[PDB]
């Protein structure tokens, strides 16, 4: 039969994002959540690792997206399609410039908003020194 | 016995569409393709029963399960005046027997015999022959059975 573990100890990861191209960076992050870097990968039990990406206001992306790409938020009322650009968020909410990208690569079921929990993206840097800080480059 | 009148108009009704209550779709009305009375007989060629009469008789001869008789301690009417005749002939209630004779006395002497069914010299029904496991008959038979075939 097939191998499945029982208990699983996770591991946390330290990652920076100075000069790191926006999307290609956050891409491996999703894979780094959905532990397919783990030969003991499990398609349901959520073994995802915890990525703590310090700093992000210094994130750059190809092209002129800083003045070209807009994100959309829809209340429900008319006139609700709020078109927010990649610049205004990179000023007062530079934290969700990555979030609403990984959720764009995490899967669709309920496990997604569990995987996405196992990850916080501050912009400082020097985050709350919890304990281990595995800086993978 | 129900009448022949529409139950309620089909136009503007809410329910379905219907008519008289003899309709088999209802209940208690009429039968569908019920079994009206009819004969089951036909006319099977005599040459099948003639030969069919012979075939079965030898079947008991081929197995020996036969006997022509002529002598009787029971030429009169008594069931006791027979079972001893069977004792002195060879019928010990083990297996069934058909009997033929032109005497209406011996029939009485066994008409109450569960394992011995009466039979007149004529209607040698192949049913009862194959029915009974052994056969008996007389010359009064073996002249008409001969005049049939013989």
């Amino acid at each position: 039969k097939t191998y499945v573990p029982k208990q699983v100890e996770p591991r946390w990861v330290l990652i920076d994002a100075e000069g790191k191209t926006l999307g290609r960076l956050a891409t491996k992050i999703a894979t780094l959540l959905r532990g397919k870097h783990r030969p003991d990968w499990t398609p349901n039990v959520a073994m995802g690792d915890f990525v703590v990406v310090v700093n992000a206001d210094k994130i750059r992306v190809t092209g002129k997206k800083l003045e070209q790409k807009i994100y959309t938020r829809y209340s429900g009322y008319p006139g609700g399609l709020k078109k927010i650009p990649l610049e205004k968020m990179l000023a007062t909410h530079p934290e969700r410039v990555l979030e609403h990208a990984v959720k764009g690569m995490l899967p669709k079921g309920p496990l997604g908003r569990r995987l996405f929990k196992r990850l916080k993206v501050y912009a400082g840097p020097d985050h709350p020194h919890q304990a281990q800080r595995p800086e993978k480059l | 016995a129900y009448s022949g009148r529409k139950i309620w108009p089909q136009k503007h009704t809410g329910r379905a569409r219907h008519g008289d209550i003899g309709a088999p779709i209802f209940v208690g009305g009429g039968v569908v393709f019920g079994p009206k009375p009819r004969d089951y007989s036909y006319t099977l060629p005599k040459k099948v029963r003639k030969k069919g009469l012979a075939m079965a008789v030898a079947d008991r001869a081929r197995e020996g399960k036969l006997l022509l008789v002529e002598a009787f301690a029971g030429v009169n009417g008594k069931t006791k005046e027979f079972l001893a005749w069977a004792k002195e002939a060879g019928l010990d209630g083990s297996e069934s027997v058909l009997l033929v004779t032109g005497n209406e006395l011996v029939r009485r002497a066994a008409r109450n015999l569960p394992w011995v069914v009466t039979l007149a010299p004529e209607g040698l029904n192949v049913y009862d022959i194959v029915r009974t496991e052994r056969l008996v008959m007389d010359l009064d038979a073996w002249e008409v059975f001969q005049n049939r075939i013989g």
């Binding site: 097939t2 191998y3 397919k36 870097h37 030969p39 398609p43 | -």
Partner: protein, 117 residues
């Protein structure tokens, strides 16, 4: 000779109930509902018994891919060498020796980097 229905029509509805056990609400007690959802099952079970491999056929690969990229090479580059080694062995499941003693598999990797570079 009349032959009413009687036993026949009931016992059958009991078998459908017999296979409709744990089906929500009417779907397991109402007969001609249970008849339905059984149709899909035997179809849903058909296709998926054809599918269960492709599920695991896929899963094994990712685990394998998880292993090779922990030596420093991709799955595409992994398999070829094995194939270059002509080893019809590796049932893509049996390459699960990443938590079933690794050197048994870790030294399957170096026997791949040979016949290609």
């Amino acid at each position: 000779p009349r032959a009413k229905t009687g036993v026949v029509r009931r016992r059958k509805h009991k078998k459908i109930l017999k296979l409709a056990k744990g089906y929500w609400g009417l779907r397991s007690k109402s007969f001609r509902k249970a008849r339905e959802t059984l149709f899909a099952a035997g179809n849903y079970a058909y296709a998926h018994r054809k599918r269960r491999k492709r599920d695991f056929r896929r899963l094994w690969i990712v685990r394998i891919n998880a292993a090779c990229r922990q030596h420093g090479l991709n799955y595409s580059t992994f398999i070829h060498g094995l194939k270059k080694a002509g080893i019809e062995v590796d049932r893509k499941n049996l390459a699960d020796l990443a938590v079933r003693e690794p050197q048994v598999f870790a030294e399957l990797v170096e026997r791949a980097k040979a016949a290609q570079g």
